[PDB]
Symmetry: C4
Subunit: 326 residues, 4 copies
């Protein structure tokens, strides 16, 4: 049995290789790179930026003082005023660099009127400070706000099922929202993933074949409050048209389900994903209800969410047979 293109948790199961021009591409797309790495690397990357700027200006300030001879008389006196009060060592230069760029500015170490190069540096570093701060806030806010994380509160059922609804034979998976905050402009997709050879003898290692779930009358758009059971009507235009309970129980393919919507707070699109191998599809089954009424409101019991119950009355032939007979 051929292994799965996307895992049940939604993760895609492909490795890329021989992209060999990538680090220049990742550099040109640096932000996308940057917000996708691990917090700890993004953070210490920003830490390096601070250290580097702090050392650099510390060093410049130290030079200025070393050369102005302030290391000898740091506090000044009548008839000698240093560039920056109280920079005596390099530690004291670095302290001043930190205190200025952070804008902590304790004051013991302090710029003077004397050297306009000392002043110019405090000006440059103030601006450099803002710049870096700004990159950081931006990076952190972006990373913080990533809507992929919202998929963790959207749930696909563990199994698909096939079964009859209103005279038609249908593939059915279920989706639900685990928060009271909505999924705006929510809509849904599906695809059949098997390899195939064309009549022109072309080999497609994994062709993706649409699994119509209502796009053409906008019935793929959903208003997901309580769980919805999605329906693919298996008919002449479906790629399960001629697939019967028998075929399925020996067949080798994958169904990929996608729910896309906007996280309500940020209106940023999330993409939730899951998958169903042929072997995870329960022919002749139906989902137990979760929605039931109460005096004032309805309620959804999420225990039953994944649970199916068998409908032995269900045809076992393909939907094609089922028409080529009737």
């Amino acid at each position: 049995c051929r292994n799965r293109f996307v895992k049940k948790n939604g993760q895609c199961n492909v490795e890329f290789t021989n992209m060999d021009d990538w680090p220049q591409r990742y550099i040109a797309d640096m932000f996308t790179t940057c917000v996708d790495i691990r917090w700890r690397y993004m953070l210490l990357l920003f830490s390096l930026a601070f250290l580097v700027s702090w050392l650099l200006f510390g060093l410049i300030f130290w030079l200025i003082a070393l050369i102005h001879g302030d290391l000898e008389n740091p506090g000044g006196d009548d008839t000698f005023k240093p560039c920056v009060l109280q920079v005596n060592g390099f530690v004291a230069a670095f302290l001043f660099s930190i205190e200025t760029q952070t804008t902590i500015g304790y004051g013991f170490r302090c710029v003077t009127e004397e050297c306009p190069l000392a002043v110019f540096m405090v000006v440059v570093q103030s601006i450099v400070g803002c710049i870096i701060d700004s990159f950081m806030i931006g990076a952190i806010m972006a990373k913080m706000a990533r809507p992929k994380k919202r998929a963790q509160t959207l749930l696909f059922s563990h199994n698909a099922v096939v079964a009859m609804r209103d005279g038609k034979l249908c593939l059915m998976w279920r989706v639900g929202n685990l928060r009271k905050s909505h999924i705006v402009e929510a809509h849904v997709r599906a695809q059949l993933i098997k390899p195939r050879i064309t009549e022109e003898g072309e080999y497609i290692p994994l062709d993706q074949i649409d699994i119509d779930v209502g796009f053409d009358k906008g019935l793929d758009r959903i208003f997901l409050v309580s769980p919805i059971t999605i329906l693919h009507e298996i008919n002449e235009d479906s790629p399960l048209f001629g697939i019967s309970r028998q075929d399925l129980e020996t067949d080798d393919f994958e169904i990929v389900v996608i729910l896309e919507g906007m996280v309500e707070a940020t209106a940023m699109t999330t993409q939730a994903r899951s998958s169903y191998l042929a072997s995870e599809i329960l022919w002749g089954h139906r989902f137990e209800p979760v929605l039931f009424e109460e005096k004032n409101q309805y309620k959804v019991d999420y225990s039953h969410f994944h649970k199916t119950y068998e409908v032995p009355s269900t045809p076992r032939c393909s939907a094609k047979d089922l028409v080529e007979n009737k």
Copy 2:
């Protein structure tokens, strides 16, 4: 009479239960959790973060001084310089922690060149400071900018109505914008919400059945300046096709109306919602006008918005009867 799936104000009326894996899911989706709680909890959550960092570093600084014996001679002298000038108590350590991380840095309490562990902490805390600040700005900006709040300046009419337009029998609700700022890419949806049993005897506790309002020619897209009256043409493909004034006045169902659009300033999608129980639909009625002209401009009088007037000339049979006769 069965209670309502969504309230008139737009609020959905369902409780979730037996989600029992949720707190790990809410943790993994922490931001979404965080921006959806109540201001006061988000705020004091960020306050805790400050206090905790402030106490923690205060404590570290106190230790360093306690052990360096700075608590005895805080100001230093010739031949003794403490790690941090003027930390004598723990209160004074906490003050220094606050002053550094806030970057207030009054200066009375002040790091020195002496102990590089003192210096390292001021470096770590400066960076930790930025990080936390950044989370806060992000959280607050996000919460601030939530477009759900925009639904408070979009208005649905209190009643639907059925009535005749250009030879066809139509469901009609009304929507309007209460701001001069627009709703971009605005478009609209509707759904019939009743339970139902399938011919395969399946029970759907609340099926959602589309209420076509023009999707197929993009006539669901609106340019909402003055109020628009939305039209569902009740025809063979409608689920009100065979529903007459009589049926309605004893029927039990809910119509759910949605207006989705982008708040102009932020281009973030809002989702406005309301509902109409069968009992809120006025068969044989029509909305009073609100738009009228003036010398230079038009004007909308919002008093008339909700008001209907009866059209006794209106057929009382279903749209099906109305064709199965003619």
Copy 3:
């Protein structure tokens, strides 16, 4: 001649009145309110917030000192240490409040270990400071980034025209981009705006009737590099179907054109708008070219953008006549 629903610049020409519940709605939707007012009001609103917090804490600090008797001995001595060094007046209390919340912290005026109420306030105010700062950055960034402003670099032609293209009679306006940065997911709409009475004798003060420009094959989606001339094919399904050059030159209606797209940098949707009164439509005309080639690249001369030239060969009857004959 009836005045125009939307001006040429894109501005809508309607006044709202007898919204009388609005200030509570505008309060609940405060952000949307806030970012839509005039810079100077948003700014001084944020200034008030500062002043108010600064006065408030200044006042609290003054009280604390007044009562601790620090106004008498501000600097302290052996055997007396005030809550906050150097607060002697209220001016000095306000200075301390400003210096702390701004985080300037000059230090002359400075909190001590003595009074934990003094300390608690510095803690509260630091956090209050961050909060307000955060609202401000958020507000300012949002206002700054509003994509409506992008419509100022999108241009509609001053006139529509009717004329023949590939055997069909067509309404044609022109759009163009005045920046080298793109308009992503750009697409376009149109509407006929006249009042009308239904056969059921209903009066619609301004009905909006779609002006198909390719929605059904996604031909309303454009890739706007050089100017595009938009086409409404006037055919049996158009509401200009039976409208001839004569009718137009005495008719009374408005055509509203919309171009929606995402500003490239921010991917926020802008909505550009213009209008054409019947009297602004040039029957039997065509736009002069703007695009011409060069050795290496193409070029658009924007002078010709608006200019039409007459095609006297153009039929003068309606597109209906033009078929009811042939």
Copy 4:
């Protein structure tokens, strides 16, 4: 051979001219202008803003002191207290302006209770400081987050190809994602770019003619994990319908390909673009595979991405011939 409308890298190849009203339009749309210029100009623009504010308030403070006679006795004494301690020069005034607005506030130079004009300025400048800071963060974050940069990690194949698939003759280009982070709501477009003269003898310098790739059944929507090969079915409704291998090898036109999608982290739409001149299209060719299986996962070898292999069995007539015969 006529030069190309859009380069292979995606860049559009048009110059605008005789926009002569533009600088007022670019000013009204200042943000869009601002975030699109070069980092170094955006940055030094913000630097100017600082300098200007710093000089301005420095100057005001200097005046106040000059006139209060503080330049003579800067430190004060019993019976004389200056507006701002220690402003003796203009350098010292500028230092104070910088220290206040940056909020560094070293403290040596320091506002007093004495002059309420001195105090008022520190208040105004604090607020002015925040404002400018806010513009900067906003500008920098926006520029930082531009999703156009994401196109650098989306790849189009260097060549299109024509070839047979499942009985139909098809144009085929290939797209792929170079990151493991997805492209949400990804979908794709295409256009034929040649000049043309209408039967009414109208000259369109570059008409854009849609190249259907599945829009009508939403098959233009893709789930791009491994590379996808896009298909234009060349049939009666295509503008390559009557184009044969011969025509192509002497023809003069350009095909423009677009992939639009949302960068996963930010959910901001990117627009990737490339182009194929008639001369870059390989009649009778097919892409080498890149996807192959492994024990646990699949893998994509990106070396083969661009590589084609000839299928000599491919018809050489147009798809029209190919039907007008059969």
